[PDB]
C-alpha cells in the first residue's frame, strides 16, 4: 500500500520567493564555455564602491539648454557667510538621483553603514585656497553659519600638488539598519545635513581666470551593506 499522507493548507499555490526548484521539461543539454572572458561579479558591492558624479541644481542663471543641472561647484569671489553646498542625507533626494549607492539603493529597502563622499579640485596650479567640509547630526533647525558647522565634525583642506580629499560621513544611529527613503521624514531615515564652507579666500595671481571649480563623488565605504529587496520604480520608461 501507499504511504499515508496529509496535504496541508498550502495546496497548489506558488510563492514568488519560494526557495525550491521545478522539474525541467527538457534536459541533458550542454552549453558554450565561459572561462575566456574576464570580469565576473560575485557581489554588486564590488560594483558599488566605484566613484560616481553627483548632480545639483544650477545656480540662478538658467541656461535654456537641456537639463540645466551641474556636476560641479562655482565658488564666488564675494564674501558672504553662508555655505557653498548643503544637502541632506536621504537616499531619494534630488541630489542623490544618479549616484551608484543611490541607484542600487533605490530598489532595496534597508542598508547599514558609512557613505564616502570625496571631492576633486580643478583649477590653475598657481591658485590656492582653504576649504573645510562639515557634517552635523539632526538638530532642530539647520546649522547655517561657521560656528555651528564648526562645533560639530569637520576637516579643513589645502590645495597643493594633489587634487582631492577622501571624506567619510560617520555612521551614528539609533538602530543598526537604516531605511533608504523616507515616507515620513523621521529620525530613522534622515541623519542631518552636510555642507562645505570656504574658510579663507581663493588666492590667485593676475591674468588667470576667476571662480575655480570642484567636482563631487559619492561611494560606499567598507561597512556599507544592503538587505531585503523591493519592487522597482518603472518611471524611467515613461
Amino acid at each position: 500500500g501507499p504511504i499515508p499522507t496529509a496535504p496541508r493548507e498550502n495546496s497548489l499555490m506558488f510563492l514568488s520567493t519560494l526557495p525550491d526548484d521545478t522539474v525541467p521539461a527538457y534536459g541533458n543539454v550542454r552549453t558554450p564555455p565561459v572561462n575566456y572572458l574576464p570580469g565576473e561579479i560575485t557581489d554588486l558591492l564590488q560594483l558599488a564602491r566605484i566613484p560616481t558624479l553627483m548632480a545639483f541644481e544650477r545656480v540662478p542663471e538658467p541656461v535654456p539648454a537641456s537639463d540645466t543641472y551641474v556636476p560641479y561647484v562655482a565658488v564666488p569671489t564675494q564674501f558672504d557667510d553662508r555655505p557653498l553646498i548643503s544637502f541632506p542625507i536621504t537616499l531619494s533626494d534630488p541630489v542623490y538621483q544618479n549616484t551608484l549607492v543611490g541607484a542600487i539603493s533605490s530598489n532595496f529597502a534597508n542598508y547599514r553603514g558609512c557613505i564616502q563622499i570625496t571631492l576633486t579640485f580643478c583649477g590653475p596650479m598657481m591658485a590656492r585656497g582653504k576649504f573645510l567640509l562639515s557634517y552635523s547630526p539632526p538638530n532642530g533647525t539647520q546649522p547655517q553659519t561657521l560656528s555651528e558647522a564648526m562645533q560639530c565634525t569637520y576637516s579643513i583642506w589645502d590645495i597643493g600638488l594633489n587634487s582631492s580629499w577622501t571624506f567619510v560621513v560617520p555612521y551614528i544611529s539609533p538602530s543598526d539598519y537604516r531605511e533608504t527613503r523616507a515616507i515620513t521624514n523621521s529620525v530613522y531615515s534622515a541623519d542631518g545635513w552636510f555642507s562645505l564652507h570656504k574658510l579663507t579666500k581663493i588666492t590667485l595671481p593676475p591674468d588667470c581666470p576667476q571662480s575655480p571649480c570642484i567636482l563631487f563623488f559619492a561611494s560606499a565605504g567598507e561597512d556599507y551593506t544592503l538587505r531585503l529587496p523591493v519592487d522597482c520604480n518603472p518611471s524611467y520608461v515613461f
Partner: protein, 34 residues
C-alpha cells in the same frame, strides 16, 4: 547557493537539472593600477 532548502537531496541528477560545460583541454577587487 542562491535560496534553497535542499540540504538533504535533489531528485534528479545534476546533469538533468542544469547544463554543464565543455572541455577545452574573502573577495577580489576589479582592476589594479600597476
Amino acid at each position: 547557493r542562491g535560496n534553497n532548502g535542499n540540504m538533504t537531496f535533489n531528485y534528479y541528477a545534476n546533469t538533468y537539472q542544469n547544463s554543464v560545460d565543455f572541455s577545452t583541454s574573502i573577495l577580489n577587487p576589479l582592476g589594479y593600477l600597476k
